[PDB]
Amino acid sequence: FDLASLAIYSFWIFLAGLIYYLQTENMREGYPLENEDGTPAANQGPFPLPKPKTFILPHGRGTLTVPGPESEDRPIALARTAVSEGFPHAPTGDPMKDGVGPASWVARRDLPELDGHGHNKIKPMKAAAGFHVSAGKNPIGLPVRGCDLEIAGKVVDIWVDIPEQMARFLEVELKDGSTRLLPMQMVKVQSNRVHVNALSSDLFAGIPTIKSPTEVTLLEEDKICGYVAGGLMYAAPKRK
Amino acid sequence: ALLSFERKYRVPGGTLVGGNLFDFWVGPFYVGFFGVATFFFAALGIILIAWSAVLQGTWNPQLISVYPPALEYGLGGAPLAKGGLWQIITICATGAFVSWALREVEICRKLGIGYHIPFAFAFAILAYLTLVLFRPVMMGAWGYAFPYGIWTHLDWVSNTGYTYGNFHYNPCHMIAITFFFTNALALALHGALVLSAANPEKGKEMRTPDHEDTFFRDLVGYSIGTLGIHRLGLLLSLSAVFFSACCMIITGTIWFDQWVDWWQWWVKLPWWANIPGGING
Amino acid sequence: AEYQNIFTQVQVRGPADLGMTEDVNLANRSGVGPFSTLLGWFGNAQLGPIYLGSLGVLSLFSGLMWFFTIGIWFWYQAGWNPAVFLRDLFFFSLEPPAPEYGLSFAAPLKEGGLWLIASFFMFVAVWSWWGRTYLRAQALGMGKHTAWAFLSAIWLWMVLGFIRPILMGSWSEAVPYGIFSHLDWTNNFSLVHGNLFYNPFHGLSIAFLYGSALLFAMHGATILAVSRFGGERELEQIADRGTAAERAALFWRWTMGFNATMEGIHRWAIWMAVLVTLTGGIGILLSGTVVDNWYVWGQNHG
Ligand code: BCL
Ligand code: BCL
Ligand code: BCL
Ligand SMILES: CC[C@H]1c2cc3[nH]c4c(c3C)C(=O)[C@H](C(=O)OC)c4c3nc(cc4[nH]c(cc(n2)[C@@H]1C)c(C(C)=O)c4C)[C@@H](C)[C@@H]3CCC(=O)OC/C=C(\C)CCC[C@H](C)CCC[C@H](C)CCCC(C)C
Ligand SMILES: CC[C@H]1c2cc3[nH]c4c(c3C)C(=O)[C@H](C(=O)OC)c4c3nc(cc4[nH]c(cc(n2)[C@@H]1C)c(C(C)=O)c4C)[C@@H](C)[C@@H]3CCC(=O)OC/C=C(\C)CCC[C@H](C)CCC[C@H](C)CCCC(C)C
Ligand SMILES: COC(C)(C)C(=O)C/C=C(\C)CC/C=C(\C)CC/C=C(\C)CCCC/C(C)=C/CC[C@H](C)CC/C=C(\C)CCC=C(C)C
Ligand SMILES: CCCCCCCC/C=C/CCCCCCCC(=O)OC[C@H](O)CO
Ligand SMILES: CCCCCCCCCCCC[N+](C)(C)[O-]
Numbered sequence A: 001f002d003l004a005s006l007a008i009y010s011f012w013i014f015l016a017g018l019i020y021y022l023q024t025e026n027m028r029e030g031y032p033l034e035n036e037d038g039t040p041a042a043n044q045g046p047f048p049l050p051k052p053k054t055f056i057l058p059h060g061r062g063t064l065t066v067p068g069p070e071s072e073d074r075p076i077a078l079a080r081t082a083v084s085e086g087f088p089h090a091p092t093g094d095p096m097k098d099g100v101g102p103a104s105w106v107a108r109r110d111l112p113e114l115d116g117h118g119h120n121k122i123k124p125m126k127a128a129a130g131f132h133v134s135a136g137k138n139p140i141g142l143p144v145r146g147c148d149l150e151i152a153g154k155v156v157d158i159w160v161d162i163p164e165q166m167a168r169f170l171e172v173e174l175k176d177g178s179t180r181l182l183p184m185q186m187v188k189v190q191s192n193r194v195h196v197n198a199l200s201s202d203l204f205a206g207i208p209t210i211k212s213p214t215e216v217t218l219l220e221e222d223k224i225c226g227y228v229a230g231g232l233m234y235a236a237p238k239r240k
Numbered sequence B: 001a002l003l004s005f006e007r008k009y010r011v012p013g014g015t016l017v018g019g020n021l022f023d024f025w026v027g028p029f030y031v032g033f034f035g036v037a038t039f040f041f042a043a044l045g046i047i048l049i050a051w052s053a054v055l056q057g058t059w060n061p062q063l064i065s066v067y068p069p070a071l072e073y074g075l076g077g078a079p080l081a082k083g084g085l086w087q088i089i090t091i092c093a094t095g096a097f098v099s100w101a102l103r104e105v106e107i108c109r110k111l112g113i114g115y116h117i118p119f120a121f122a123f124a125i126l127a128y129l130t131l132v133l134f135r136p137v138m139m140g141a142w143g144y145a146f147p148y149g150i151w152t153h154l155d156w157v158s159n160t161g162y163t164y165g166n167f168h169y170n171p172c173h174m175i176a177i178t179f180f181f182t183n184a185l186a187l188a189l190h191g192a193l194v195l196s197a198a199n200p201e202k203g204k205e206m207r208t209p210d211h212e213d214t215f216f217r218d219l220v221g222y223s224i225g226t227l228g229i230h231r232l233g234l235l236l237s238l239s240a241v242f243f244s245a246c247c248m249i250i251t252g253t254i255w256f257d258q259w260v261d262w263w264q265w266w267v268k269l270p271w272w273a274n275i276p277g278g279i280n281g
Numbered sequence C: 001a002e003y004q005n006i007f008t009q010v011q012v013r014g015p016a017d018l019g020m021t022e023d024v025n026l027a028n029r030s031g032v033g034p035f036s037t038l039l040g041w042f043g044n045a046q047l048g049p050i051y052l053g054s055l056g057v058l059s060l061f062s063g064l065m066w067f068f069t070i071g072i073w074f075w076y077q078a079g080w081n082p083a084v085f086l087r088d089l090f091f092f093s094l095e096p097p098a099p100e101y102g103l104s105f106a107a108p109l110k111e112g113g114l115w116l117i118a119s120f121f122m123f124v125a126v127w128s129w130w131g132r133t134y135l136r137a138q139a140l141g142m143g144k145h146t147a148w149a150f151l152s153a154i155w156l157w158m159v160l161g162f163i164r165p166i167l168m169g170s171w172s173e174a175v176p177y178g179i180f181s182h183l184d185w186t187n188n189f190s191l192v193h194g195n196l197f198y199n200p201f202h203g204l205s206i207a208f209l210y211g212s213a214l215l216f217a218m219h220g221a222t223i224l225a226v227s228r229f230g231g232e233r234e235l236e237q238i239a240d241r242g243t244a245a246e247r248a249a250l251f252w253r254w255t256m257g258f259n260a261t262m263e264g265i266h267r268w269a270i271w272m273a274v275l276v277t278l279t280g281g282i283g284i285l286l287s288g289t290v291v292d293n294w295y296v297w298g299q300n301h302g
């Protein structure tokens, strides 16, 4: 048993200590584990719950402490399909409208995300002085087609991540002249149309609306995004 | 058990094979058809290693070595104790890996997320298949594959590379290495950058993403962006493994000599032919 | 062709972003630079601005002098021939002093003394750049993780060309300045020391270089799989979990039985990479000093 022997055995004891640190750090959300009725689970594993930590949030938004008491802060319209644990929970209503499965949102902060200086991070381009399409097919004015191949509206604006200068949303003008937002990560921009494989046209109006025309909350974003991604599962009866 | 937010995601749907028949979880582990399959393929392969272990006569993980068939079996088959076990085991592993990426795909469908992950894994599968299938077949024999041993597969890397002088001079080997280093450089900076913003100095509020951009602009003069660093991380890691796969598939089939000889193409070039001076003149 | 967020579809562009001030000495901060439409296909198009104060300038000065010291030695070894210079560019090499010069600094210029002078210049470029990566983070109210993770890489570097040759007793033991020559040295080093594949800190360094590539493929793809919910906005997901983070963790929990948080995958990531050269540094410091033959030693011990 030499210095290199000592060394390597020590590194593996460190290493086990480091994995123990990292797993528990990675338990600051979602823990403790719950039974399928949502009460504390009997068994939690070997790794303990981590000691709380706090983040002081900028712009006076307060403080976050994790792990804190977890609650979904939202009605979950779902129900056990099975007596013993491990099975699907089937949606009791319209999963898309109700926000479950691939349609889930989180009760996020109903405030908009702020940049370093305290202005809204996201703004529709025609509220963002100086912003313009700089390359690739500029999509404003384009008809928006869903997976039923029928048109749902026409693009009126691009909603941009200012600090980072990226298209995030297409604002889309529907049959009644109102608009919804469409994630940029979920559309195909083509020379003559914007195609949205996630939703059929008839569903475009079930996109959750924003309570203001030149900002969007994280709560809103989350509803708007999970619903569009929920169409991959739920509007596939109409995908041909 | 469940994460306190997991319940609303455990919906039926998204299966690719078998409808709802396998749509369930075992503890935290989703099942689905391909977890059935993964289990089958990986269960068989582990038995046959245990077999291949009782023939060798040792139950020590550090000595167990499943060897590929002899060079002299070409691409045929072999008895179970002369390569046949390596051949089936290779088939269960390939089944287990492909199944694993496909089960991941069902999980991407149920959770409604991108298919980026099982596509990135599939590069690891190409790498494996390159060493155990594409390369040995092109060379004409399974025996050119690496054995399933903890230390014997490092001897295989050793023996193989020193067949070409120094495998360092393989120009695709250096591109793969450059990508692997740069991936690690980037994973270190990128985790350090987020942690430096999530956990600022004492007596400070949690920093913002603009604080992340300015750090790197101050530091090197450019911030790739929070979406770009993740594309960069993915591009970096997959490129390493794709050039590994290149560097090996061309070694033995279309290049045979000391890999350093390849670099006579630059030296003997005509516009500095025979000059007196330097290392090579 | 369901779009995959690998390349941008529509680049947009507005006023340059000047960045946070906090406590940065704006006097030492350059103006903002051009916009690369070409780099906008993959990430941010904006180029600059950079900080450049006392530390950065000292760093780039010596860093250049290390580059112009090695280069002029190449220019000499090529007979100052601008064609012999490009021919053998990857074959030229600034070698440390021969062993019997020991750690003496009286080794002549053409026979080791020049290696000592570039190595001084490079020593200063790195450490005052390291000090820069730290102060850049102070000026902005950020934790120091960047400088700490960078001291991990410095560590194996200080080991190769400084710490280990000292403990071996001569400059000859250091790594020559040359493309191919430093690879030859890396091959030689494994043979001299009894196959490095059997140096158990090397076999750890590999697991982490590999695992560093495993983890970023894992993480980079996950964040792109959940960018359709703003998943790359990691701070506010850390601040305030959104379905993006919930969906990221559950893919992995269902897939392999356990999962991270949007903060904690960054701790896995910083450590996975950092450990690459922490272990790599230890295994090299120990070669020739405490362990002569790593293969034989693998038989004595384990
Ligand atoms: C004596 C040794 C030779 C040499 C000979 C070779 C040879 C020979 C090869 C390499 C290869 C590699 N070399 Mg070289 N090489 C040398 C020097 C170096 C040096 C150095 C510092 O000097 C470096 C950094 C490298 C770098 C590398 C990479 C380019 C590459 C390894 C990664 C890879 O392929 O992943 C690819 C990834 C995989 C194969 C992993 C696939 C995993 C599968 C899909 C999943 C497995 C799951 C498992 C069964 C699960 C267990 C259970 C769960 C854990 C619960 N070489 C010297 C000169 N090198 C290899 C290569 O390019 O391969 C393509 C290769 O064959
Ligand atoms: C890549 C180019 C070469 C190669 C060259 C090297 C070199 C060189 C080294 C290794 C090292 C390792 N290699 Mg190898 N190796 C290759 C192919 C593989 C394959 C494969 C299916 O293709 C696997 C599973 C492994 C596995 C491993 C481990 C023994 C070890 C650490 C890897 C690691 O952390 O990776 C990153 C992955 C992770 C961090 C995730 C966890 C991975 C776990 C540990 C893999 C477990 C495999 C298990 C022991 C066997 C299967 C169990 C079965 C049920 C029987 N190698 C090819 C042939 N490999 C190192 C070592 O210590 O060797 C002794 C080392 O020095
Ligand atoms: C034939 C060759 C030998 C061998 C000999 C060596 C030797 C010798 C070494 C390694 C080391 C490494 N080996 Mg080995 N290795 C072999 C086989 C392999 C194989 C394989 C598949 O066969 C692989 C994957 C590896 C893998 C690796 C890595 C795990 C490790 C390097 C970490 C790193 O990032 O260093 C690269 C990173 C750095 C060097 C850090 C640099 C930090 C500095 C401060 C940055 C300076 C920048 C400079 C100023 C320039 C700035 C310029 C301006 C920006 C323009 N080895 C065989 C057996 N290997 C190293 C190690 O640690 O071993 C324990 C090492 O030194
Ligand atoms: C987890 C460890 C991994 C890692 C980590 C790591 N490296 C780091 C960091 C971290 C965490 C930093 O914070 C630090 C940094 O600043 O990052 C941006 C860095 C860094 N890692 C670097 C390199 C590097 N890291 C490597 C490896 C790795 N680093 C590991 C894989 C490697 C290799 C061999 O694998 C290299 C080469 C640098 C980019 C940087 C350290 C910079 C430094 O100190 O530089 C001093 C030199 C200068 C300031 C100037 C040099 C000038 C040139 C010599 C001139 C040549 C140019 C020519 C004259 C130009 C002509 C005109 C032009 C307009 C064309
Ligand atoms: C391309 C970039 C990197 C990459 C990516 C990557 N790998 C991945 C993923 C991704 C994105 C996954 O989604 C997937 C995963 O689930 O990760 C946790 C995976 C994964 N990468 C893993 C390992 C791994 N990846 C590696 C490499 C890489 N993975 C690249 C560097 C390496 C090495 C050596 O570099 C290893 C060892 C696993 C943890 C996991 C896949 C787990 C899996 O497939 O499980 C199903 C199979 C089983 C449970 C058991 C199979 C048993 C066999 C039938 C018997 C053994 C056969 C084998 C050939 C023996 C090997 C013996 C050794 C001595 C060689
Ligand atoms: C256009 O041409 C001109 C002339 C203008 C050029 O500028 C061209 C220049 C070049 C072509 C140069 C290119 C350089 C290379 C090809 C060399 C590549 C170098 C490497 C790969 C380095 C490999 C590793 C080097 C290491 C490990 C260095 C370690 C450094 C030490 C830790 C520093 C320790 C310092 C010491 C010992 C100094 C001692 C003295 C003191 C006072 C402290
Ligand atoms: C094409 C040539 C092939 C070689 C590959 C060339 C790429 C060079 C990479 C350098 C890594 C250093 C920069 C990457 C690290 C960025 C850190 C980070 O996390 O960035 C977040 C963002 O910038 C703020 O939000
Ligand atoms: C190399 C990767 C393996 C590291 C292991 C990290 C933690 C694994 C166990 C986590 C426990 C999760 N669980 C089941 C308690 O919820």
Ligand SMILES: CCCCCCCCCCCC[N+](C)(C)[O-]
Pocket: B220, B221, B222, C030, C031, C032, C033, C034, C047, C048, C049, C050
């Ligand atoms: C990877 C790209 C390199 C980034 C480095 C950019 C340095 C910024 C300097 C911009 C100069 C501005 N100005 C107008 C004073 O020239």
Ligand SMILES: CCCCCCCCCCCC[N+](C)(C)[O-]
Pocket: C032, C033, C034, C035, C036, C037, C038
């Ligand atoms: C050196 C002066 C820096 C200021 C110049 C600003 C460059 C932006 C020019 C926009 C051009 C876009 N383009 C054509 C490059 O794609």
Ligand SMILES: CCCCCCCCCCCC[N+](C)(C)[O-]
Pocket: A018, A019, C199, C200, C201, C202, C203, C204, C207, C211, C268, C271, C272, C275
């Ligand atoms: C911080 C992440 C922890 C991941 C550690 C992975 C351990 C890989 C085991 C490789 C074994 C090395 N060795 C030399 C003992 O064979």
Ligand SMILES: CCCCCCCCCCCC[N+](C)(C)[O-]
Pocket: B028, C256, C257, C258
């Ligand atoms: C550390 C390298 C290989 C070891 C195997 C990986 C650890 C097991 C990960 C799965 C744990 C899930 N579980 C059962 C705790 O819930």
Ligand SMILES: [Fe+3]
Pocket: B190, B194, B230, C219, C223, C234
């Ligand atoms: Fe990230």
